[PDB]
Amino acid sequence: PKIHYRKDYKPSGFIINQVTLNINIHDQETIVRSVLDMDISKHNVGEDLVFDGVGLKINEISINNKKLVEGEEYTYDNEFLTIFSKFVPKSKFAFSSEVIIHPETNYALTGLYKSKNIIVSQCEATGFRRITFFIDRPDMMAKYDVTVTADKEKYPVLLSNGDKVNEFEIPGGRHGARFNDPPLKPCYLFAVVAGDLKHLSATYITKYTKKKVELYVFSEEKYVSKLQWALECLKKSMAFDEDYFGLEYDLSRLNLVAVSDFNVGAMENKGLNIFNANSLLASKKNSIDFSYARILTVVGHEYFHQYTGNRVTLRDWFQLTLKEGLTVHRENLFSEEMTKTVTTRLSHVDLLRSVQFLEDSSPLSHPIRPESYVSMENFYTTTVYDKGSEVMRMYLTILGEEYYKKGFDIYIKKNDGNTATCEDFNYAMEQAYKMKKADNSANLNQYLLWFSQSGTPHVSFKYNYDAEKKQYSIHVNQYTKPDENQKEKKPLFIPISVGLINPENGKEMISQTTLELTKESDTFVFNNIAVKPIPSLFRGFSAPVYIEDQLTDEERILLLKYDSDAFVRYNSCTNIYMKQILMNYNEFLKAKNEKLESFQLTPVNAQFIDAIKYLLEDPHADAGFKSYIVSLPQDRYIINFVSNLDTDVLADTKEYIYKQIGDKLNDVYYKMFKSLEAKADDLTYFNDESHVDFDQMNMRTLRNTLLSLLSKAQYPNILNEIIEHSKSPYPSNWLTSLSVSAYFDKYFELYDKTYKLSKDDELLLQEWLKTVSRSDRKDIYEILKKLENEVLKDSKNPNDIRAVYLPFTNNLRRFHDISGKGYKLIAEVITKTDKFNPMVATQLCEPFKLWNKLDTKRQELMLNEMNTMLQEPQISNNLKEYLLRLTNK
Ligand SMILES: O=C(N[C@@H](C(=O)NO)c1ccc(-c2cc(F)c(F)c(F)c2)cc1)[C@@H](F)C(F)(F)F
Ligand SMILES: [Mg+2]
Ligand SMILES: [Mg+2]
Ligand SMILES: [Mg+2]
Ligand SMILES: [Mg+2]
Ligand SMILES: [Zn+2]
Numbered sequence: 001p002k003i004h005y006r007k008d009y010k011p012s013g014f015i016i017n018q019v020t021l022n023i024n025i026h027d028q029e030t031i032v033r034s035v036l037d038m039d040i041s042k043h044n045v046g047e048d049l050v051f052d053g054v055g056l057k058i059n060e061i062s063i064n065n066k067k068l069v070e071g072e073e074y075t076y077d078n079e080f081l082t083i084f085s086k087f088v089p090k091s092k093f094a095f096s097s098e099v100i101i102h103p104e105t106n107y108a109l110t111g112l113y114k115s116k117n118i119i120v121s122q123c124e125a126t127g128f129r130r131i132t133f134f135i136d137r138p139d140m141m142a143k144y145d146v147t148v149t150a151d152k153e154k155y156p157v158l159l160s161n162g163d164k165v166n167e168f169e170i171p172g173g174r175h176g177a178r179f180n181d182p183p184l185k186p187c188y189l190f191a192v193v194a195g196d197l198k199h200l201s202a203t204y205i206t207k208y209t210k211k212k213v214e215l216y217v218f219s220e221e222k223y224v225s226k227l228q229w230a231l232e233c234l235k236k237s238m239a240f241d242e243d244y245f246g247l248e249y250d251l252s253r254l255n256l257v258a259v260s261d262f263n264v265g266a267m268e269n270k271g272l273n274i275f276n277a278n279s280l281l282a283s284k285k286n287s288i289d290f291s292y293a294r295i296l297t298v299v300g301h302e303y304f305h306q307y308t309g310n311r312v313t314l315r316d317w318f319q320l321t322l323k324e325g326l327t328v329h330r331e332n333l334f335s336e337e338m339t340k341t342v343t344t345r346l347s348h349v350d351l352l353r354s355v356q357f358l359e360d361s362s363p364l365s366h367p368i369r370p371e372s373y374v375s376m377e378n379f380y381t382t383t384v385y386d387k388g389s390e391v392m393r394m395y396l397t398i399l400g401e402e403y404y405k406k407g408f409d410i411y412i413k414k415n416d417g418n419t420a421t422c423e424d425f426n427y428a429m430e431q432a433y434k435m436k437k438a439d440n441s442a443n444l445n446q447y448l449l450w451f452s453q454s455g456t457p458h459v460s461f462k463y464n465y466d467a468e469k470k471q472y473s474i475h476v477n478q479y480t481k482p483d484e485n486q487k488e489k490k491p492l493f494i495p496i497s498v499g500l501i502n503p504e505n506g507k508e509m510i511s512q513t514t515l516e517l518t519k520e521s522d523t524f525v526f527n528n529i530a531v532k533p534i535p536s537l538f539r540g541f542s543a544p545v546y547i548e549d550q551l552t553d554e555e556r557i558l559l560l561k562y563d564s565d566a567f568v569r570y571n572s573c574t575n576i577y578m579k580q581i582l583m584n585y586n587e588f589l590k591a592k593n594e595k596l597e598s599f600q601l602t603p604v605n606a607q608f609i610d611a612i613k614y615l616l617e618d619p620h621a622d623a624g625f626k627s628y629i630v631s632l633p634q635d636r637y638i639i640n641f642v643s644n645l646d647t648d649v650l651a652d653t654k655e656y657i658y659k660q661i662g663d664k665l666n667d668v669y670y671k672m673f674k675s676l677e678a679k680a681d682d683l684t685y686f687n688d689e690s691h692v693d694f695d696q697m698n699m700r701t702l703r704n705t706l707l708s709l710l711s712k713a714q715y716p717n718i719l720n721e722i723i724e725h726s727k728s729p730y731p732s733n734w735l736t737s738l739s740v741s742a743y744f745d746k747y748f749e750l751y752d753k754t755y756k757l758s759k760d761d762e763l764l765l766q767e768w769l770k771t772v773s774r775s776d777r778k779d780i781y782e783i784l785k786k787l788e789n790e791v792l793k794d795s796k797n798p799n800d801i802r803a804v805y806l807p808f809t810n811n812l813r814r815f816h817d818i819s820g821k822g823y824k825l826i827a828e829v830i831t832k833t834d835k836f837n838p839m840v841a842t843q844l845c846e847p848f849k850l851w852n853k854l855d856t857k858r859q860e861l862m863l864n865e866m867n868t869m870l871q872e873p874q875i876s877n878n879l880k881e882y883l884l885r886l887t888n889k
Contacts, residue, residue, distance in 0.1 A: 325388020
């Protein structure tokens, strides 16, 4: 099993200057003819010519138009084509081949495949080798000349990278299109699409060069009415890159294409971005609210890759975070500016500290630039993406906007048209740092540890105030726990955005201040501090760390009410919740262990409940923020703070705390649920797909959150509200009516009603499936069986499989049933999926990531299912590799 090491990078002994492809699509097979115009590099030492080529059927291979013969001049083992060096030319030469591949039965959705009636490619990371022979690595840059042919009736729309330079008819009802793409590119950015596609289009005129860019968004005919918001988002993306970064699109045309079957969200193929339909298509009648921000982020994300990934590309795959962490960061800047809601940044942090923190304290922990890999298909992680983005964002926090923009432009101008590494980016940032600090002696060498060191730093605080001296001190410590990647962890460059709040009037006591913590510990002192402040720490979540604020709940409540920073207010609330959760958890655990007949629980802080009421009742406060404060921290955030977590005891703990708060605030909840209706459910723009109001959507989130709290509580006659909610035109509302009805006799009536509403739109039905999957039902296993038999069946669509099973795995009480029946069920699905799509099978492993954090019975149960999956004779490379790492084997 080949392990690739970052330190082993060496450039190829060969060069590929030109790729000329003929892709001929037929009913039962696809024939690919390829001529590679090649050369010998200065690094060549007379080695064999070895091409990647996976699952290819060879019809012929030639060098300089001379047929090569198997055995004597070459060998092929279904993974590598080896041409013996005595037969390899010493100067420029042409290599040609004709292979047969079979998109129809390509269910792994890598290489060239069929999604419904669309032929489509996915080449990142090493999928191009499933299409034709190549030296399949991103430093092998080449020009591409691509001809596609196909039955005209089935496949009237033909697309690839570059300009369409010819279209022609072919005898027998066929037709072709030729695309020439002169700029050099790595092969993972090659794409081809063929199908009966329908489109919306527009023309965009660039800000500075005033170039006309044609924008096309494509889908199957059935869903063409769902393309409009995507086009709006594309225009928005282009404008933001122009306005913030001064960057314009360089090509005459940009195509976005939705396909039903896709392993991830989307792919940034040059001039031909290809999307999971769930991340490109929406309409207000047929999509939940979440689709709108999803499409905005994903369209934005693929667009921003045109610079950070496409024009400036990767030397090697170990540099993945250089294009993904940076493009996620650009996408976050964009979406924050587009939505103008504080919950956009909060939602990113919420995801990082639950999902990515879990990963980073799991056996799978890695730095954002790993040292090795076996499977690229398993490399695309929340660590590389989301911790990557936080590391890219810290440069902005450290430099400020002006010098960050200067540094970023240095990176682009210096590396445009080339491969690059993480060091190139740090170097560019460092140049800006020298300018900002006004001495060329300043450096960011310590910053590189963010790329190489794994694990989440813990940052903790102590304070001192001298009332006579008017002198305030913040003592800060950082610590990262040793793990498998470093025995000794080094201190990082941690930027701490801080404010000081006057507790008497809630005002700022100092100007904007970013503490630069560069040692294991430091003391930051402030003079002329007139009164003892409450510190506002890591404003905007200014570093990806565990924050231990060492504040009292009284101080935290003051910040929650009066601080200026949304994240610190949100975090202060989170910290109050966590102190309560840990306390009640231990009390419940003790009662369980000692088999107590009676015991006490510590009630929720009443001033805290009063603070929530205060904020909820404030008509000038933000609805999205309001929905965060009435929600306990995510289970996957909580689990980072508890050893041997008994999921039952945690379920009882959450139940107690929600009941405590609802016993005081339910009337407030109910009043708000009713008063929010007019604005939240306003239909004025329901038939305008260009009008998206993120505040209004946050009001609906708040109503739907409140409705859930009231339904769980069995608030008097809340079922009436539920039934009326089911008649709302907004799918976020009527799907919510299904999940909250779980607590009532009406559940299966709403199940049928909402099914009938959902069944004729592919993506809406997947949303319905998710809603059922995550329904708080005691009969949820019986319900899942019904979904399998009646709706899911033997679908190989990753959207269908993920929709049915993943939401259920977050059911704390039932997925973690002490019998192990939920672990058994998800392992059976993983093994079944692994037969045809190893990448998605490993995605479906996600609930096992925390296995060694649970109580010892559940650790044993999970480990048993993982060992069972590992023992499957036909297990894929992906899944084997992943489970071996996860189980510390
Ligand atoms: O869709 C995502 N990421 C893709 C991306 O970065 N688009 O710009 C992405 C694209 C391709 C792959 C990928 C990697 C492989 F190794 C494959 F085999 C494969 F089929 C897809 C993974 C993630 C999500 F991270 C996002 F962006 F949040 F939606
Ligand atoms: Mg094959
Ligand atoms: Mg503009
Ligand atoms: Mg389908
Ligand atoms: Mg290990
Ligand atoms: Zn990306």
